[PDB]
Design a protein around this ligand. Sequence first.
Ligand SMILES: CC(=O)N[C@H]1[C@H]([C@H](O)[C@H](O)CO)O[C@](O)(C(=O)O)C[C@@H]1O
Length: 412
Amino acid sequence: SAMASINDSKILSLQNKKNALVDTSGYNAEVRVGDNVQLNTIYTNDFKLSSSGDKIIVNLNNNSAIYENSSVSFWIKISKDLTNSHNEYTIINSIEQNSGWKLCIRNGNIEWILQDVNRKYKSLIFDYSESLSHTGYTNKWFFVTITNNIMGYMKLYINGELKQSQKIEDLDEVKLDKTIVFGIDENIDENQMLWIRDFNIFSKELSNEDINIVYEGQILRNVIKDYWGNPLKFDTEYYIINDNYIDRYIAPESNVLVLVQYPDRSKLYTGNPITIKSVSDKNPYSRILNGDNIILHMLYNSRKYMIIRDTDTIYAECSQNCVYALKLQSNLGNYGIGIFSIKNIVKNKYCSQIFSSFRENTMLLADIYKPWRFSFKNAYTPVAVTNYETKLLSTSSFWKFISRDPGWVEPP
Ligand SMILES: CC(=O)N[C@H]1[C@H]([C@H](O)[C@H](O)CO)O[C@](O)(C(=O)O)C[C@@H]1O
């Protein structure tokens, strides 16, 4: 079992147990967590570095210099205001004297550095920002993996994909720091913060296959994700967008839902917040899982409506290639016509597909239609279509849920 071989090689694993961050690898590293450091806010094993002063100090146990291969893996999510800074910040520091490793952020890039006793160093750089493209990873969870073969290469993977390699075999002795410090020493502002979760070190060089198993394991494949890669939750406001129309928000026009172009593509939090309600009554704010039944409530001009499927097809009972537009109802309640189900889809994720099984099996997608009974006007229209097997991989069927998140602040 690869996954057992993987886990057996862990020599540090920071995980939250009884509300403390501790090493659960079996090796008993000392973990000193700053009083103000927030733990377990999004993911069980996460921590927030939200300030200078916020620090976590790890002191590794007795098992001078690097003697063996190794890998380091964690997820990271870096706020917009931190990503947009042109400065450089050390985030994780494990250099003593002048040798060891460190992870830095600089101008929208993450950078891993390995430095020998003469201060010769090699770096791995990844531009996670892509100039703040709502297409990049600004404020989105992504999975980092560094692997080291001391008689070979140091490699940087992102979400299981190799991004850069550098020979390290030609460095002189790299002394190994028994201390690892998480935290930003620089003088950061209020909106500059980042989160890390599932930080692990392995005593071997993980293979790309091994890396993909860790990635798939820690992404939580049965948990639906919001736009940032956080778990999607009930009773939480989201701006829901279609993958094909990312600068359009959902809105009712004459009680037909359509997609309206953002007046300003740079502002994410635009439109009518939709709250997801559990059919089965779960604890408030509980995570939404793959396959859950859900009900969608829109806040529109300060009143709550339930989103429901149209009773009749769009060019109108129907069996063959039916297309239904959507609408709003002010009566909240468990109505089959307003029950949907939500499923994960997998490289490009953090998006979801939505289905309804009321009377006919449909999938929600967006395209151009004439959704008004008394008009031939076109509109980008979210619709529930039958016979959707050939559309199961169409981006028109992918939906994202943008939550107001602390790592992405928009002027008031
Ligand atoms: C004017 C308007 O909004 N008409 C809508 C009607 C009325 O909501 C319904 O007849 C009850 O009055 O329902 C639909 O036909 C439907 O659900 O199939 C869609 C149509 O867009």
